[PDB]
Amino acid sequence: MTYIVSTSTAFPENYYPQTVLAAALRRFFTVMELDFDLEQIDRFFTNVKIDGRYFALPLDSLLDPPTWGVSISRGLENSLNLAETAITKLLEKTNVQPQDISLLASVSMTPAIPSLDGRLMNRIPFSSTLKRLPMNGVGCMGGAFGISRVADYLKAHPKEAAILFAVEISSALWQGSLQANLTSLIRRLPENPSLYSEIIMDIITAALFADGCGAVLMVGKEHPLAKSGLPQVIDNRSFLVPNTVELMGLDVVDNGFRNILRPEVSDALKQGLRPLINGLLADNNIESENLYRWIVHPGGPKVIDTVEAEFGLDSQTLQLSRDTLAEVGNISSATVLYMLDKVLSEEQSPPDSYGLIVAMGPGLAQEAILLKW
Amino acid sequence: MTYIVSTSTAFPENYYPQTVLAAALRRFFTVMELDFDLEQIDRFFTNVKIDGRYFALPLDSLLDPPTWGVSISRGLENSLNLAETAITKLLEKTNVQPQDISLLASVSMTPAIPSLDGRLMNRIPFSSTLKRLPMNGVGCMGGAFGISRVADYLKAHPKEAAILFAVEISSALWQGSLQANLTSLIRRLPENPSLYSEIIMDIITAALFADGCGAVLMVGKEHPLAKSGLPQVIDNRSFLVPNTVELMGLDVVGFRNILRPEVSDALKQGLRPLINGLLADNNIESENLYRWIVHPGGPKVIDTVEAEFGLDSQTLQLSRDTLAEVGNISSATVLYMLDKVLSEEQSPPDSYGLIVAMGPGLAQEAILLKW
Numbered sequence: 001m002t003y004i005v006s007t008s009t010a011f012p013e014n015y016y017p018q019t020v021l022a023a024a025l026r027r028f029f030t031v032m033e034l035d036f037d038l039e040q041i042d043r044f045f046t047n048v049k050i051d052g053r054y055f056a057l058p059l060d061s062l063l064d065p066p067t068w069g070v071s072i073s074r075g076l077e078n079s080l081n082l083a084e085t086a087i088t089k090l091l092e093k094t095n096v097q098p099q100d101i102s103l104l105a106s107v108s109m110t111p112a113i114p115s116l117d118g119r120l121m122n123r124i125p126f127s128s129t130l131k132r133l134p135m136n137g138v139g140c141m142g143g144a145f146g147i148s149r150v151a152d153y154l155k156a157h158p159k160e161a162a163i164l165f166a167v168e169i170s171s172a173l174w175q176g177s178l179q180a181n182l183t184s185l186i187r188r189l190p191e192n193p194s195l196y197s198e199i200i201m202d203i204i205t206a207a208l209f210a211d212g213c214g215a216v217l218m219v220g221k222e223h224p225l226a227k228s229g230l231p232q233v234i235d236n237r238s239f240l241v242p243n244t245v246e247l248m249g250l251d252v253v254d255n256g257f258r259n260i261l262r263p264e265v266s267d268a269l270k271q272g273l274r275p276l277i278n279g280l281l282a283d284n285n286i287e288s289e290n291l292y293r294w295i296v297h298p299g300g301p302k303v304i305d306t307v308e309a310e311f312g313l314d315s316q317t318l319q320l321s322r323d324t325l326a327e328v329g330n331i332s333s334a335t336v337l338y339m340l341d342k343v344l345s346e347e348q349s350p351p352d353s354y355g356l357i358v359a360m361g362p363g364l365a366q367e368a369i370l371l372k373w
Numbered sequence: 374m375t376y377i378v379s380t381s382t383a384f385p386e387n388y389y390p391q392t393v394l395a396a397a398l399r400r401f402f403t404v405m406e407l408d409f410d411l412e413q414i415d416r417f418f419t420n421v422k423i424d425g426r427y428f429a430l431p432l433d434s435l436l437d438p439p440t441w442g443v444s445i446s447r448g449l450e451n452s453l454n455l456a457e458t459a460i461t462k463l464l465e466k467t468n469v470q471p472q473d474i475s476l477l478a479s480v481s482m483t484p485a486i487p488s489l490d491g492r493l494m495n496r497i498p499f500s501s502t503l504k505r506l507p508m509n510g511v512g513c514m515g516g517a518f519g520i521s522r523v524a525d526y527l528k529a530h531p532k533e534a535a536i537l538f539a540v541e542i543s544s545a546l547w548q549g550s551l552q553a554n555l556t557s558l559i560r561r562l563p564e565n566p567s568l569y570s571e572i573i574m575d576i577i578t579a580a581l582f583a584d585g586c587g588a589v590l591m592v593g594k595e596h597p598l599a600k601s602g603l604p605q606v607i608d609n610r611s612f613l614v615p616n617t618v619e620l621m622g623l624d625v626v627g628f629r630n631i632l633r634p635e636v637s638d639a640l641k642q643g644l645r646p647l648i649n650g651l652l653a654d655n656n657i658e659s660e661n662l663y664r665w666i667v668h669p670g671g672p673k674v675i676d677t678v679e680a681e682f683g684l685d686s687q688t689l690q691l692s693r694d695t696l697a698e699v700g701n702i703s704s705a706t707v708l709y710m711l712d713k714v715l716s717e718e719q720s721p722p723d724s725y726g727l728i729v730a731m732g733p734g735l736a737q738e739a740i741l742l743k744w
């Protein structure tokens with residue numbers, strides 16, 4: 001099995017209260033004379049249950065946005081800076097030399113060819129023969145997805161150590177994509193009311209997603225750092241719900257990027273969540289009521305409610321999902337790593353207690369990881 | 374260890390002779406009255422030593438490019454179609470059901486969130502719990518890179534079978550990106566003389582890169598298909614040359630392909646440390662290798678590998694023949710070459726082969742094979 005040894009996070013300098021971000025979007029609507037009810041901005045910025053968010057990229061780009069390449073360059077540079085900080089903090093706290101890392105796995109939606117993990121090799125003295133696992137196309141689920149893929153690798157390499165990091169810059173959407181699309185949709189709205197749901201989805205995207213980075217150090221069973229107090233990855237499983245590609249994803253469009261998040265995600269989630277988790281738990285002779293801890297990615301407050309209702313959970317079991325959403329918002333693939341970092345600073349989990357990491361993302365795909373302390 | 378069982382390829386319907394592609398680019402320069410030597414286009418389209426290329430995206434609309442939104446959707450759809458065809462041929466020729474594949478690995482620069490491998494489970498009846506390995510950020514190295522990562526997974530799963538596919542749509546750059554960049558670059562050439570080298574690199578990009586897909590079926594040692602005589606993946610290794618990020622890659626701006634002239638010289642810093650170290654740790658020398666399978670980044674790349682290892686002029690002929698047949702199809706190229714080896718050539722028993730590819734980073738990948 002694989003041992004999760006330590007975690008770290010990194011955030012940009014500028015933390016904005018959710019009230020400030022809502023007012024920023026309201027002002028953009030108002031200065032632009034867009035015929036749309038401003039109360040819907042407040043409604044969805046309130047209903048997402050987020051108190052504030054880190055933005056790596058400027059907020060003033062709302063009114064006058066820079067060029068595509070400039071924003072792309074800034075997102076790439078900020079992603080590298082956060083990833084380097086998270087990895088350096090992780091290595092320092094574990095007293096692990098970079099040359100003793102065998103695999104560096106990455107998940108990020110920031111366009112990077114070569115990948116972020118390759119570029120970091122020029123900032124941190126990894127050995128030039130470092131193995132890399134640059135993953136993409138997984139979106140919000142990438143944090144849990146990466147843990148599973150690294151655990152599968154360390155199954156065959158019990159002596160090795162691996163680092164996984166997840167970094168996302170959701171503020172790139174505020175650099176011109178959200179502005180151009182909301183303007184076009186609202187101005188074309190009078191001629192066809194079918195665009196109303198499209199405007200709402202873009203407002204929800206502006207309300208929900210934030211910037212951040214998390215990292216995790218994972219080692220094989222025979223590594224010196226594999227100690228009995230640590231969570232062990234004992235199994236993992238993926239699930240993809242058929243014919244749900246259009247429900248969630250990130251599309252490249254004329255206006256830049258467009259985040260896709262349809263309201264039918266919550267009901268498609270039910271089609272995959274219980275078959276995924278029930279099968280994983282049963283195949284390990286575990287019942288869900290005996291799980292000591294849940295670590296569920298907060299795609300939204302509705303997603304948390306759906307997971308709670310589907311498994312009949314007491315409403316403080318997923319409190320970490322709600323607290324994380326309030327503190328940092330939805331930071332996409334990095335969120336579950338941030339949450340895992342919070343757990344590892346809680347008191348020592350009772351021995352032999354079982355935990356579950358659950359994430360959902362484009363696909364529509366779900367990832368489940370069974371942990372044991 | 375890990376066995377390579379079979380391979381397949383998939384290409385779009387339109388095969389364009391290189392002279393036709395060169396003529397199309399000249400027509401763009403001529404119509405737009407771009408002040409630049411038209412014979413620079415002819416020499417670079419000729420000197421890449423490519424006879425023709427497959428373009429999945431249209432060439433008719435070169436002078437009137439469609440929107441970038443519909444180009445991405447077309448590239449996404451063409452990528453899905455080529456991958457589905459290659460995987461289906463692979464499954465049919467091996468008589469393997471989709472539900473019996475444990476892992477589907479993908480490498481592609483085509484923007485896809487969710488990834489291509491996820492979207493393919495709605496076209497091919499894979500199990501809903503299929504494990505996926507969507508990789509990106511590796512460019513032309515992807516095919517060799519994917520083989521190594523699947524091999525490492527199958528080291529922990531000796532009973533399982535995995536599919537890797539690589540697909541790239543290089544013709545996406547002909548849907549507006551090369552047109553916009555070359556126009557602006559040529560206009561500023563009188564004002565900025567140093568922009569000549571930038572025009573050359575875009576012309577080389579237009580001459581070099583093509584579309585295609587390749588797929589490979591790999592199994593662990595305990596799988597029923599793991600029979601003697603098939604190539605074994607006995608080891609693999611990666612190498613990234615320090616401080617060479619700007620030499621190769623793909624930038625968002627549409628796109629711009631980055632391929633600096635210093636690429637071939639920078640390869641010398643990584644090739645021999647990578648390959649000789651890998652072979653020494655497996656108790657063989659490069660002279661023991663019976664077959665080289667080297668990604669043809671270009672005629673200069675092939676020559677550099679030849680000189681670094683003191684190879685005969687025909688040892689890397691497969692790289693040159695592939696370049697002539699289909700051009701540089703990026704991550705898919707080495708899979709196409711491996712397909713030629715497994716399907717058309719005799720590999721002596723217990724002989725050694727080496728897959729070598731290089732891509733953005735600058736990175737190189739080596740995979741040691743044994744029959």
Ligand SMILES: CCCCCCCCCCCC(=O)CC=O
Pocket residue numbers: 075109110111138139140141168169170172173209248249250257259260332361362486
């Ligand atoms: C350079 C960064 C480009 C912008 C990244 C977008 C970050 C927001 C997360 C939602 C995107 C998505 O749909 C996939 C997740 O499920």
